[PDB]
Write a protein that binds this ligand. Structure first.
Ligand code: NDP
Length: 476
């Protein structure tokens, strides 16, 4: 099936044990000084040894840090690598309420490193930022957002990017030597998870072809909330849900009933026999979401959430992105999803579906903030499953016909890299296959791998695509 052919999933596969020798040159470890006390942080510092130079990254001050870094590099000469432990700062930034401090500080570290001319590869360390290997629990969706940013740093600054490595719960000497061995030589891998049983690396693979009924998707009924539901993809989603038996669709967006084409969408849906509520509700406004849930009919309880609210504009290259630009991109993603998760964790939903992006799955140059914000969605769906709650994340490629890519500016970039426009019917038919399987995570994308692989790997290899035979063929 053509719909099967759109579905991919991320997998984690065992890679080689690294060597036993620590790096020969000096490491620079970067610490968030208010968030330096987590057991994993202390275990990593202890692993890097006391000849490691330590840099405390205080506040969020690019220029100040560029000066401090330039001095360290003057005094020490080249470093072997930069090891960032800033991900431990999960608290939200005081001035940008949708940005985790660690995320803002990682962006400023990547910028300031470039500003000072430190060229040693940067490695971003997380703990519980990914779900790698069977039974693995993703404990920190916040740190998971950092992997969306790091993949984009690897595309924009390939020559000074090491990679990402997730630490285990307890960093024992076996975990420590795996870490220090990877910092000595990682075999070309750059998205790694250290676990009890071995070191795992991230891979993209074609998904299992569809099986009718396997995940036992309950029939669509009751009230379903589609945030961004007046939007391109969200309106098509609502039409499908209508066709599928929803009693009541609650569509939200900032503009609500004043959104473009909202009257037409309400009319098409109602012709189908559905109750329609359209509300103007910022998805990051907790009190407004609560008010909306409190209003639902007794006879039509919430049964599902489809989170399509989001913006992609006003992003920027890693070297330029501001914290205010990052905040505005994170708002509908991190803040809204966190509220949706908190207000439905007790409702026994049949589906909690979060719409992510290929920028968060593989990465796309020029879109670091969107990549981080979408990577948090993917992370939260895995975390929710760990709590015994339903969730899925669907990272879309490019939609044709409706939505954000229907601009010869935004359309023509993606398609030229081999990320082709999907027919909405095909994209939705694939999503239903994912829902019928009850899968946690998928990318649904039409790819031209002959165009995509070579373009994506022009400046550094990708181990992520080694598990796509089309990509392996294109690079042969
Ligand atoms: N189109 C595509 O190819 C792809 C889309 N995606 C993702 O799919 C989802 C749908 O995108 P698409 O339909 O194409 O985009 P659209 O711009 O058509 O729809 C996005 C919308 O979400 C709403 N929205 C934006 N911010 C908020 C907010 N803070 N609170 C509530 N609603 C908000 C918008 O309305 P308003 O401005 O009135 O709030 C609009 O309804 C997005 O999350 C997007 O990131 C991912 C990959 C590809």
């Amino acid at each position: 099936s053509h719909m099967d052919a759109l579905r991919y999933h991320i997998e984690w596969n065992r890679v080689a044990e690294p060597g036993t020798a620590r790096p020969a040159g000096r490491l620079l470890a970067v610490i968030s000084p208010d968030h330096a006390g987590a057991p994993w942080v202390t275990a990593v510092l202890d692993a890097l040894g006391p000849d490691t130079v330590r840099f405390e990254a205080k506040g969020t001050d690019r220029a100040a840090w560029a000066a401090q870094l330039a001095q360290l590099r003057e005094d020490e000469g080249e470093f072997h690598a930069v090891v960032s432990l800033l991900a431990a700062a999960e608290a939200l930034h005081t001035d940008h309420g949708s940005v985790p401090l660690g995320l803002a500080q990682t962006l400023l570290l990547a910028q300031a490193l470039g500003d000072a001319g430190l060229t040693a590869p940067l490695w971003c360390l997380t703990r519980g930022g990914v779900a790698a290997g069977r039974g693995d629990v993703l404990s920190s969706p916040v740190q998971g957002a950092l992997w969306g940013l790091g993949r984009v740093i690897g595309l924009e600054h390939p020559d000074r990017w090491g990679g990402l490595i997730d630490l285990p719960e307890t960093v024992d000497t076996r975990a420590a030597a795996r870490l220090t061995g990877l910092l000595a030589d990682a075999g070309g891998e750059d998205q790694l998870a250290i676990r009890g049983s071995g070191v795992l690396a991230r891979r993209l693979a074609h998904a299992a072809p569809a099986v009718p009924g396997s995940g036992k998707r309950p029939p669509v009924h009751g009230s379903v909330l589609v945030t961004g539901g007046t939007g391109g993809i969200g309106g098509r989603v609502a039409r499908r849900l209508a066709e599928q038996g929803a009693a009541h669709l609650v569509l939200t967006s900032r503009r609500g009933a004043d959104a473009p084409g909202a009257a037409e969408l309400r009319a098409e849906l109602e012709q189908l026999g559905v109750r329609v509520t359209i509300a103007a509700c910022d998805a990051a406004d907790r009190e407004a979401l609560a008010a909306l849930l409190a209003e639902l009919p007794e006879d039509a309880p919430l049964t599902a959430v489809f989170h399509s609210a989001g913006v992609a504009h006003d992003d920027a290259p890693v070297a330029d992105l501001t914290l205010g630009q990052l905040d505005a991109l994170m708002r509908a993603k991190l803040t809204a999803a966190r509220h949706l998760h908190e207000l439905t964790a007790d409702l026994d939903l049949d589906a909690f579906v979060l719409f992510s992006s290929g920028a968060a799955v593989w990465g796309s140059g020029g879109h670091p903030g969107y990549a981080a914000a979408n990577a948090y969605l993917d992370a939260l769906a895995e975390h929710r499953r760990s709590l015994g709650l339903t969730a899925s994340s669907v990272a879309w490629g490019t939609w044709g016909e409706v939505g954000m890519a229907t601009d010869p500016e935004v359309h023509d970039r993606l398609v030229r890299q081999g990320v082709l426009a999907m027919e909405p019917e095909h994209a939705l038919g694939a999503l239903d296959q994912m829902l019928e399987n009850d899968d946690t995570a998928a990318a649904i994308t039409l790819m031209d791998w002959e165009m995509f692989a070579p373009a994506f790997t022009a400046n550094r290899p990708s181990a992520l695509l080694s598990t796509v035979p089309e990509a392996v063929s294109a690079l042969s």
